[PDB]
Amino acid sequence: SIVAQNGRLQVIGTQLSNEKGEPVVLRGASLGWHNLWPRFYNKNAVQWLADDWKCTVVRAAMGLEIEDNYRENPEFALQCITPVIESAIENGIYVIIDFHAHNKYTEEAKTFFAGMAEKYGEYPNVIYEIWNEPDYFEWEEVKTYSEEVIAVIRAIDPDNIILVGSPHWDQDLHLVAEDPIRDVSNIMYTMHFYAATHEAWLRDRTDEAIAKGIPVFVSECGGSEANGDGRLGIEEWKTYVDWMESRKISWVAWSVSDKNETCSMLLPRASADGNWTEDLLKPWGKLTRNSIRNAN
Ligand SMILES: [Mg+2]
Protein backbone atom coordinates (compact mmCIF):
# COMPACT_ATOMS: atom_id res chain seq x y z
CA SER A 1 0.00 0.00 0.00
CA ILE A 2 0.94 3.67 -0.56
CA VAL A 3 1.08 4.38 3.21
CA ALA A 4 3.32 1.30 3.73
CA GLN A 5 5.57 2.50 0.86
CA ASN A 6 5.69 6.19 1.93
CA GLY A 7 4.85 6.42 5.68
CA ARG A 8 4.74 9.91 7.22
CA LEU A 9 4.47 12.69 4.61
CA GLN A 10 6.40 15.99 4.75
CA VAL A 11 6.69 19.18 2.70
CA ILE A 12 10.16 20.07 1.40
CA GLY A 13 10.25 23.50 -0.21
CA THR A 14 7.00 23.17 -2.19
CA GLN A 15 7.04 19.42 -2.79
CA LEU A 16 4.86 16.97 -0.86
CA SER A 17 7.28 14.13 -0.02
CA ASN A 18 7.60 10.75 1.81
CA GLU A 19 9.59 9.75 4.94
CA LYS A 20 12.71 9.31 2.77
CA GLY A 21 12.16 12.73 1.08
CA GLU A 22 11.18 11.39 -2.35
CA PRO A 23 8.32 13.31 -4.02
CA VAL A 24 4.84 11.88 -3.52
CA VAL A 25 1.90 12.62 -5.78
CA LEU A 26 -1.44 11.52 -4.34
CA ARG A 27 -4.36 10.93 -6.73
CA GLY A 28 -7.87 10.09 -5.56
CA ALA A 29 -11.49 11.06 -5.01
CA SER A 30 -13.57 13.07 -2.51
CA LEU A 31 -16.85 11.89 -1.03
CA GLY A 32 -19.39 14.69 -1.31
CA TRP A 33 -20.93 16.69 1.55
CA HIS A 34 -21.63 13.97 4.18
CA ASN A 35 -24.98 15.65 4.98
CA LEU A 36 -26.09 15.15 1.32
CA TRP A 37 -24.65 11.74 0.37
CA PRO A 38 -24.08 9.96 3.70
CA ARG A 39 -24.70 6.47 2.25
CA PHE A 40 -21.20 6.42 0.70
CA TYR A 41 -19.49 7.12 4.06
CA ASN A 42 -18.78 3.48 4.83
CA LYS A 43 -15.81 1.11 4.92
CA ASN A 44 -16.65 -0.80 1.74
CA ALA A 45 -16.94 2.27 -0.49
CA VAL A 46 -13.49 3.35 0.71
CA GLN A 47 -11.93 -0.11 0.13
CA TRP A 48 -13.54 -0.19 -3.30
CA LEU A 49 -12.06 3.27 -4.14
CA ALA A 50 -8.67 1.99 -3.00
CA ASP A 51 -8.81 -1.37 -4.82
CA ASP A 52 -10.74 -0.68 -8.05
CA TRP A 53 -10.19 3.10 -8.66
CA LYS A 54 -6.62 2.93 -7.25
CA CYS A 55 -7.17 5.95 -5.00
CA THR A 56 -4.08 6.71 -2.92
CA VAL A 57 -6.07 9.38 -1.12
CA VAL A 58 -9.73 9.71 -0.03
CA ARG A 59 -11.33 12.94 1.17
CA ALA A 60 -14.05 13.05 3.79
CA ALA A 61 -16.13 16.17 3.22
CA MET A 62 -17.66 17.01 6.59
CA GLY A 63 -20.34 19.56 5.73
CA LEU A 64 -20.55 22.68 7.86
CA GLU A 65 -23.33 24.19 5.68
CA ILE A 66 -26.72 22.98 4.42
CA GLU A 67 -29.28 21.13 6.59
CA ASP A 68 -27.99 18.43 8.99
CA ASN A 69 -24.36 19.75 9.02
CA TYR A 70 -21.75 19.35 11.80
CA ARG A 71 -22.94 22.37 13.86
CA GLU A 72 -26.58 21.18 13.84
CA ASN A 73 -25.78 17.43 14.14
CA PRO A 74 -22.16 16.59 15.11
CA GLU A 75 -22.97 12.98 16.14
CA PHE A 76 -24.11 12.17 12.59
CA ALA A 77 -21.07 13.97 11.15
CA LEU A 78 -18.86 11.78 13.41
CA GLN A 79 -20.88 8.65 12.43
CA CYS A 80 -20.01 9.35 8.75
CA ILE A 81 -16.30 10.33 8.84
CA THR A 82 -15.17 7.66 11.36
CA PRO A 83 -15.61 4.58 9.11
CA VAL A 84 -13.98 6.49 6.21
CA ILE A 85 -10.91 7.39 8.37
CA GLU A 86 -10.72 3.89 9.85
CA SER A 87 -11.09 2.26 6.43
CA ALA A 88 -8.28 4.43 4.99
CA ILE A 89 -6.08 3.18 7.86
CA GLU A 90 -7.23 -0.41 7.25
CA ASN A 91 -6.61 -0.29 3.48
CA GLY A 92 -3.28 1.57 3.62
CA ILE A 93 -4.25 4.90 2.01
CA TYR A 94 -4.13 8.58 2.98
CA VAL A 95 -7.24 10.38 4.11
CA ILE A 96 -8.13 14.06 4.16
CA ILE A 97 -10.34 15.17 7.03
CA ASP A 98 -12.10 18.13 5.45
CA PHE A 99 -13.93 20.78 7.49
CA HIS A 100 -16.24 21.46 4.61
CA ALA A 101 -17.15 25.08 5.27
CA HIS A 102 -17.66 28.23 3.22
CA ASN A 103 -18.27 30.52 6.21
CA LYS A 104 -15.79 31.08 9.06
CA TYR A 105 -16.34 28.77 12.09
CA THR A 106 -13.17 29.34 14.13
CA GLU A 107 -14.16 27.84 17.51
CA GLU A 108 -15.89 24.79 15.96
CA ALA A 109 -12.80 24.13 13.82
CA LYS A 110 -10.48 24.28 16.86
CA THR A 111 -12.61 21.90 18.91
CA PHE A 112 -13.16 19.52 16.00
CA PHE A 113 -9.52 19.40 14.91
CA ALA A 114 -8.25 19.07 18.51
CA GLY A 115 -10.42 15.95 18.84
CA MET A 116 -9.32 14.63 15.44
CA ALA A 117 -5.68 15.44 16.26
CA GLU A 118 -5.94 13.54 19.58
CA LYS A 119 -7.65 10.49 18.08
CA TYR A 120 -5.77 10.17 14.81
CA GLY A 121 -2.59 12.34 14.82
CA GLU A 122 -0.12 9.44 15.20
CA TYR A 123 -1.39 7.74 12.01
CA PRO A 124 0.59 8.78 8.92
CA ASN A 125 -2.60 8.37 6.80
CA VAL A 126 -4.27 11.48 8.15
CA ILE A 127 -4.22 14.88 6.44
CA TYR A 128 -6.24 17.83 7.85
CA GLU A 129 -8.01 20.33 5.62
CA ILE A 130 -9.03 23.16 7.87
CA TRP A 131 -11.41 25.24 5.72
CA ASN A 132 -12.74 23.80 2.45
CA GLU A 133 -13.59 26.90 0.45
CA PRO A 134 -13.51 30.32 2.03
CA ASP A 135 -15.59 32.53 -0.32
CA TYR A 136 -15.97 36.30 0.40
CA PHE A 137 -13.13 37.10 2.83
CA GLU A 138 -9.85 38.95 2.81
CA TRP A 139 -6.83 36.62 2.96
CA GLU A 140 -5.77 38.22 6.29
CA GLU A 141 -8.96 36.96 8.01
CA VAL A 142 -8.41 33.43 6.63
CA LYS A 143 -4.71 33.50 7.61
CA THR A 144 -5.67 34.38 11.22
CA TYR A 145 -8.20 31.54 11.35
CA SER A 146 -5.53 29.27 9.90
CA GLU A 147 -2.73 30.35 12.29
CA GLU A 148 -5.10 29.77 15.22
CA VAL A 149 -6.36 26.33 14.07
CA ILE A 150 -2.85 25.23 13.03
CA ALA A 151 -1.64 26.29 16.51
CA VAL A 152 -4.20 23.97 18.12
CA ILE A 153 -3.44 21.05 15.77
CA ARG A 154 0.34 21.30 16.05
CA ALA A 155 0.24 21.21 19.88
CA ILE A 156 -1.17 17.63 19.65
CA ASP A 157 -0.02 16.50 16.16
CA PRO A 158 3.33 18.14 15.38
CA ASP A 159 4.06 16.43 12.01
CA ASN A 160 0.94 15.56 9.90
CA ILE A 161 0.02 17.60 6.84
CA ILE A 162 -2.41 20.52 7.19
CA LEU A 163 -4.02 21.88 4.04
CA VAL A 164 -4.93 25.58 4.10
CA GLY A 165 -7.74 27.13 2.09
CA SER A 166 -7.80 30.63 0.65
CA PRO A 167 -10.52 33.08 -0.45
CA HIS A 168 -12.60 32.78 -3.62
CA TRP A 169 -12.85 28.98 -3.36
CA ASP A 170 -9.10 28.46 -2.97
CA GLN A 171 -8.26 30.66 -6.02
CA ASP A 172 -6.39 33.51 -4.24
CA LEU A 173 -2.96 31.89 -4.04
CA HIS A 174 -1.46 35.19 -5.27
CA LEU A 175 -2.65 36.75 -1.95
CA VAL A 176 -1.08 33.81 -0.07
CA ALA A 177 2.17 34.35 -2.05
CA GLU A 178 2.40 37.95 -0.76
CA ASP A 179 1.53 37.11 2.89
CA PRO A 180 2.22 33.42 3.77
CA ILE A 181 1.97 31.73 7.16
CA ARG A 182 5.45 31.71 8.75
CA ASP A 183 7.29 29.50 11.27
CA VAL A 184 5.11 26.49 10.39
CA SER A 185 6.13 23.13 8.90
CA ASN A 186 4.26 20.51 6.85
CA ILE A 187 1.50 22.73 5.56
CA MET A 188 0.27 23.22 1.99
CA TYR A 189 -2.21 25.59 0.41
CA THR A 190 -5.23 24.30 -1.46
CA MET A 191 -6.37 25.13 -4.95
CA HIS A 192 -9.74 24.11 -6.43
CA PHE A 193 -10.52 24.06 -10.16
CA TYR A 194 -13.45 22.98 -12.34
CA ALA A 195 -12.14 22.49 -15.84
CA ALA A 196 -15.21 23.67 -17.82
CA THR A 197 -15.24 27.07 -16.00
CA HIS A 198 -11.76 28.01 -14.82
CA GLU A 199 -9.45 28.82 -17.74
CA ALA A 200 -5.61 29.02 -18.03
CA TRP A 201 -5.22 32.01 -15.66
CA LEU A 202 -5.73 29.79 -12.57
CA ARG A 203 -2.88 27.43 -13.61
CA ASP A 204 -0.63 30.47 -14.25
CA ARG A 205 -1.56 32.01 -10.90
CA THR A 206 -0.86 28.67 -9.20
CA ASP A 207 2.53 28.31 -10.97
CA GLU A 208 3.44 31.88 -9.92
CA ALA A 209 2.65 31.02 -6.28
CA ILE A 210 4.72 27.80 -6.44
CA ALA A 211 7.66 29.90 -7.79
CA LYS A 212 7.34 32.21 -4.76
CA GLY A 213 7.64 29.12 -2.46
CA ILE A 214 3.94 28.28 -1.89
CA PRO A 215 3.25 24.52 -1.67
CA VAL A 216 0.02 23.62 -3.55
CA PHE A 217 -2.28 20.61 -3.04
CA VAL A 218 -5.46 20.34 -5.16
CA SER A 219 -7.86 19.02 -2.46
CA GLU A 220 -10.88 19.33 -4.76
CA CYS A 221 -11.31 19.45 -8.51
CA GLY A 222 -13.47 18.37 -11.41
CA GLY A 223 -14.19 18.29 -15.13
CA SER A 224 -17.65 19.81 -14.73
CA GLU A 225 -18.46 23.55 -14.45
CA ALA A 226 -17.86 25.38 -11.12
CA ASN A 227 -21.41 24.82 -9.80
CA GLY A 228 -20.89 21.00 -10.13
CA ASP A 229 -23.13 20.79 -13.22
CA GLY A 230 -23.14 21.91 -16.89
CA ARG A 231 -20.61 20.74 -19.48
CA LEU A 232 -18.04 18.01 -18.93
CA GLY A 233 -14.86 19.64 -20.29
CA ILE A 234 -12.92 16.50 -21.22
CA GLU A 235 -10.04 18.18 -23.07
CA GLU A 236 -9.76 20.84 -20.34
CA TRP A 237 -9.65 18.05 -17.70
CA LYS A 238 -6.77 16.41 -19.58
CA THR A 239 -4.92 19.77 -19.76
CA TYR A 240 -5.23 20.28 -15.99
CA VAL A 241 -4.25 16.71 -15.09
CA ASP A 242 -1.21 16.82 -17.42
CA TRP A 243 -0.21 20.19 -15.94
CA MET A 244 -0.53 18.82 -12.37
CA GLU A 245 1.43 15.66 -13.22
CA SER A 246 4.36 17.67 -14.67
CA ARG A 247 4.30 19.87 -11.51
CA LYS A 248 3.95 16.79 -9.20
CA ILE A 249 0.82 18.42 -7.66
CA SER A 250 -1.45 16.00 -5.77
CA TRP A 251 -5.16 15.97 -6.75
CA VAL A 252 -8.57 14.81 -5.54
CA ALA A 253 -11.57 14.59 -7.90
CA TRP A 254 -15.13 15.65 -6.77
CA SER A 255 -17.57 13.94 -6.09
CA VAL A 256 -18.42 10.35 -5.25
CA SER A 257 -22.14 11.08 -5.09
CA ASP A 258 -25.35 10.42 -7.10
CA LYS A 259 -27.19 13.72 -7.55
CA ASN A 260 -28.42 14.55 -11.08
CA GLU A 261 -25.40 16.78 -11.70
CA THR A 262 -22.35 16.41 -13.99
CA CYS A 263 -19.89 16.34 -11.03
CA SER A 264 -21.70 13.39 -9.26
CA MET A 265 -19.75 10.33 -10.40
CA LEU A 266 -22.38 7.58 -9.77
CA LEU A 267 -25.96 6.71 -10.72
CA PRO A 268 -28.46 6.48 -7.80
CA ARG A 269 -28.85 2.76 -8.56
CA ALA A 270 -25.25 2.20 -7.44
CA SER A 271 -24.72 0.27 -4.19
CA ALA A 272 -23.44 2.21 -1.18
CA ASP A 273 -20.91 -0.62 -0.70
CA GLY A 274 -19.17 -0.32 -4.11
CA ASN A 275 -18.75 -2.90 -6.91
CA TRP A 276 -19.72 -0.20 -9.41
CA THR A 277 -19.88 -1.82 -12.85
CA GLU A 278 -19.27 0.47 -15.86
CA ASP A 279 -23.01 1.18 -16.37
CA LEU A 280 -23.25 2.66 -12.84
CA LEU A 281 -20.48 5.14 -13.49
CA LYS A 282 -21.50 8.49 -14.84
CA PRO A 283 -19.35 9.93 -17.69
CA TRP A 284 -17.40 12.00 -15.09
CA GLY A 285 -17.13 8.82 -12.96
CA LYS A 286 -15.53 6.90 -15.82
CA LEU A 287 -13.19 9.78 -16.64
CA THR A 288 -12.19 10.11 -12.95
CA ARG A 289 -11.65 6.36 -12.50
CA ASN A 290 -9.51 6.15 -15.64
CA SER A 291 -7.58 9.29 -14.76
CA ILE A 292 -6.72 7.94 -11.33
CA ARG A 293 -5.95 4.38 -12.52
CA ASN A 294 -3.57 5.38 -15.33
CA ALA A 295 -1.71 7.91 -13.10
CA ASN A 296 -1.43 5.22 -10.34
MG1 LIG B 1 1.46 13.12 13.63
Numbering used by the authors: 11 to 306
Task: Provide the authors' own sentences about this structure as they appear in the paper.
In this study, we report a novel endoglucanase, Cel5R, that belong to GH5 family, identified by soil metagenomic approach, which is tolerant to high salt conditions with moderate tolerance to temperature and pH. Cellulases belong to glycosyl hydrolase family of enzymes (including endo-, exo-glucanase and β-glucosidase) which catalyze the degradation of cellulose into glucose monomer units (cellulolysis) in a concerted manner. Endoglucanase (EC 3.2.1.4) randomly cleaves internal β-1,4-glucan linkages, producing free ends. Surprisingly, the Cel5R shows halotolerance and extreme halostability in 4 M NaCl, 3 M LiCl and 2 M KCl which is higher than other known halostable cellulases.
To understand the molecular mechanism of Cel5R, its crystal structure was determined by molecular replacement method at 2.2 Å resolution. The crystal belonged to P212121 space group, and consists of two Cel5R molecules in an asymmetric unit. The results of PISA33 server did not indicate any stable interaction at the protein-protein interface, thus eliminating the possible existence of Cel5R as dimer in solution. The overall structure of Cel5R was similar to other members of the GH5 family, and consists of (β/α)8 – barrel fold, commonly known as the TIM barrel. Along with canonical TIM barrel fold, the structure had two extra β-strands running antiparallel to each other at the N-terminus. The superposition of Cel5R with other cellulases indicated that the residues Glu143 and Glu230 were likely to be two critical residues, where Glu143 acts as a proton donor while Glu230 acts as a nucleophile. In Cel5R the distance between Glu143 and Glu230 was found to be 6.2 Å suggesting it may follow retaining mechanism. In Cel5R, the subsites −2 and −1 were occupied by glycerol molecules. The crystal structure analysis indicates that the free cysteines in Cel5R are involved in hydrogen bond interaction with the neighboring residues that are participating in catalysis (interactions between Cys65 with Leu59, Cys90 with Phe86, Cys231 with Val262 and Csy273 with Gly238, Glu271). The crystal structure analysis also reveals that the halophilic nature shown by Cel5R may be due to acidic residues (16.7% with 52 residues) present on the surface of the protein.
